[PDB]
């Protein structure tokens, strides 16, 4: 009667809280004490990409570590050639308010979302020479915040109507709906094998989803405010989040627990984006004081600063082979680092 | 001078692309963008009909100056209000005749205070509209409303000295419609710090003048911002 059955909430929730204390024998800061630090990391700006004329919201690296796509609120989608700073394509959008973009792992397609409730798919390799829109995916009742391709026919996405959805592109329909969040969903991250994904939301919680079945499996609550960024460890047994309360955290799957926090006392502003380097030693975060920090993921000890942006850092990604790091910002510039 | 014959034709493709990027970014430079908020029951549907002749977009032009309006058709207005941090003005529409519908005016006062004291709108100014004055006149006089019941501070409230009443109306509706106008000004003239200012108005459903009162306020917003940084104001 909504008073006795929600008395079984904390009757059941303290079983989970008093079993994460049983499976905690030590700390990540007690095991990585004896190893040496990485020293100092000194990256330089090698390239600078010019031409967006307005704020940049999202970018995504191609899978050959040479192409990239970026999205700006002037209504333009640009494909870059990062080695020579050439422009391959420039695609106009119908809505200027775009919030995300994605590059397909085959290289044939590009997706983008935004404040309209539809997710557009664009075809790059056409016979007639130009770039056309192939299908618009309608069915959400809020703004789109993130989207990632699985193959040329399946794309997953998150939205401001508190739900996530799996799509079939060739028909244009929703096939699976992931419900359970309370607030708006801001970010998602796919696994290296597209079988599970993770997503963080504005209720200070992140949860792990099974793609084929379609249900929640685990829930992680350690933050104090809204979660804006998420990314998997390259192993597939950990992920890391970034929030508004000036703290990144690292969570475990098989332990179902938080085991590291990345904070400093002179930082008070929120984290906008988070990525990993391969082997998972470096943890890069894009902050709100116009900088970018390069954390050491095993000892939680700050070991680098990527300064050089005039405005807010919006997005950052790392190539698949590990060569470069790109950063995007509100001052209409993209910078290719080390 | 080391490029291939195909490497030179890809450089020529890149220079032809950003020639079209500059001609698109220079035809959108002197276009002013307006964010239209509201409270649902207000007449922001029919103000769009006045200002004209997912998200929704209105486009009009006054005196060869282009304007560009938006409407986001809840509990958290966060995580999308930060996109509109470089607009010219926010247009706020409040139905000023609903104080007894229960409380549909304190709900509008709680919304205006959240918009004002937001960190992404520190330099954004608000054009305020108090429409449905046709319903406010028939409710104060010759009615059962008695504003002193729903608000416990209307009871003293002498009429301000800067009031310019429209000729023919009673002093009862003039003490009423200036009390609701000053309730919004008490939140704006408390933390503005010279960075942004409110601009109240009075309108109805059959009044057709509201494109001129947006054109004139957008000029006064830009003049008051450049005069502040030259230390003339």
């Amino acid at each position: 009667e909504l008073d006795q059955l929600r008395q079984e909430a904390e009757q059941l929730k303290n079983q989970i809280r008093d079993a994460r204390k049983a499976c905690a024998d030590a700390t990540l800061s007690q095991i990585t004490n004896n190893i040496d630090p990485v020293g100092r990391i000194q990256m330089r700006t090698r390239r600078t990409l010019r031409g967006h004329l307005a704020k940049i919201y999202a970018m995504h690296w191609g899978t050959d570590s040479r192409l990239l796509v970026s999205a700006s609120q002037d209504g333009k989608l640009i494909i870059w050639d990062s080695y020579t700073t050439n422009k391959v394509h420039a695609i106009p959008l119908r809505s200027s308010w775009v919030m995300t973009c994605a590059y397909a792992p085959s290289g044939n397609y590009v997706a983008c979302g935004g404040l309209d409730n539809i997710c557009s798919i664009y075809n790059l390799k056409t016979r007639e020479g130009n770039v056309r829109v192939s299908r618009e995916l309608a069915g959400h009742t809020g703004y789109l915040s993130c989207c990632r391709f699985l193959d040329d026919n399946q794309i997953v996405t998150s939205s401001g109507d508190t739900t996530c959805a799996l799509w079939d592109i060739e028909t244009g329909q929703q096939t699976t709906t992931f419900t359970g969040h309370t607030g708006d969903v801001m970010s998602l991250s796919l696994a290296p094998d597209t079988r599970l994904f993770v997503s963080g939301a504005c209720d200070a919680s992140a949860k792990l989803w099974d793609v084929r079945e379609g249900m929640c499996r685990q829930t992680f609550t350690g933050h104090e405010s809204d979660i804006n960024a998420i990314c998997f460890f390259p192993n597939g047994n950990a992920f890391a989040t970034g929030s508004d309360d000036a703290t990144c955290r690292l969570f475990d799957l098989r332990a179902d627990q938080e085991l590291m926090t990345y904070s400093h006392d002179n930082i008070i502003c929120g984290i906008t984006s988070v990525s990993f380097s391969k082997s998972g030693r470096l943890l890069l975060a894009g902050y709100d004081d116009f900088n970018c920090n390069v954390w050491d993921a095993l000892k939680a000890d700050r070991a680098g600063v990527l300064a050089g942006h005039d405005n807010r850092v919006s997005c950052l990604g790392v190539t698949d082979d590990g060569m470069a790091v790109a950063t995007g910002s509100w001052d209409s510039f993209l910078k290719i680092w080390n | 001078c080391t490029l291939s014959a195909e490497d030179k034709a890809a450089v020529e493709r890149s220079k032809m692309i950003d020639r079209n990027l500059r001609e698109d970014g220079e035809k959108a430079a002197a276009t002013h963008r307006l964010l239209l908020l509201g409270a649902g029951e207000s007449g922001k549907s029919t103000i769009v009909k006045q200002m004209r002749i997912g998200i929704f977009e209105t486009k009009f032009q006054v005196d060869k100056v282009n304007f560009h309006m938006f409407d986001v058709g809840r509990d958290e207005r966060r995580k999308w209000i930060q996109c509109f941090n470089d607009v010219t003005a926010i247009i706020f529409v409040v139905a000023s005749s609903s104080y007894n519908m229960v409380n549909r005016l304190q709900e509008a006062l709680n919304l205006f205070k959240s918009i004002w004291n937001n960190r992404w709108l520190r330099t954004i100014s608000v054009i305020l509209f108090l429409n449905k004055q046709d319903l406010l006149a028939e409710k104060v006089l010759a009615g059962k409303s008695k504003i002193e019941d729903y608000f416990p501070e209307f009871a003293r409230y002498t009429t301000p000295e800067d009031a310019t009443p429209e000729p023919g109306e009673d002093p009862r509706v003039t003490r009423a419609k200036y009390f609701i106008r000053d309730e919004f000004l008490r939140i704006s003239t408390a933390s503005g710090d010279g960075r942004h200012y409110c601009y109240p108005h009075f309108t109805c459903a059959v009044d057709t003048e509201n494109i001129r009162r947006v054109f004139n306020d957008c000029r006064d917003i830009i003049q008051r911002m450049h005069l502040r940084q030259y230390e003339l104001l």
Partner: single-chain antibody
Amino acid sequence: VQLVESGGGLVQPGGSRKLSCSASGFAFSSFGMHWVRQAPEKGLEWVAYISSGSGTIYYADTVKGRFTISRDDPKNTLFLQMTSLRSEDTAMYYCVRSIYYYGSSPFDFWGQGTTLTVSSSDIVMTQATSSVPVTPGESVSISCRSSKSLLHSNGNTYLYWFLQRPGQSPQLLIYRMSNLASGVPDRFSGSGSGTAFTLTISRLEAEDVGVYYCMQHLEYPLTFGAGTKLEL
């Protein structure tokens, strides 16, 4: 995608003639165009070029200063103006579209050609085989060679392969020595390094009968091979 040429005919030696290439079905203004001719007892020979935007125009040395190329973008029409036609200007003039960016495929669509009868340092590409007999079950290999190494310092190798089955216009098989064109079966495969190149056919159907050409695209002018005829 369509390209239709018209304008050819019998020209007295010394006059003039206009040619047209009417495009249809694709975004004509973002493509660069070429003219390629073929004398009735010779192979393929490049003529001219005009870039996307009319900002780069090249010519061949046997027509430089005598031929004029021009394009009309919003009417989708390519022009070639010839003056003082010699007796060695008897060929079939083709019209080829070509786009250039990272990963693109140049020279991937040809027209049908018009006929113009006239009454009365360079990289040399060597294709030193006249004819090869085949039978539709067995492998066959063609070779081509160059005076200069076509490998560039970035990492590309600008060698192309074309096939002209008789009674038709050529088509693209291999671009940049390793990559298949669209709508081509995977039994074709090119290989080589630096100066020696090979094209491989595994199981011949009845359609794999005709002349095979090799082209280089390292620098201008573009020089073809002599051609290798396959026959049953």
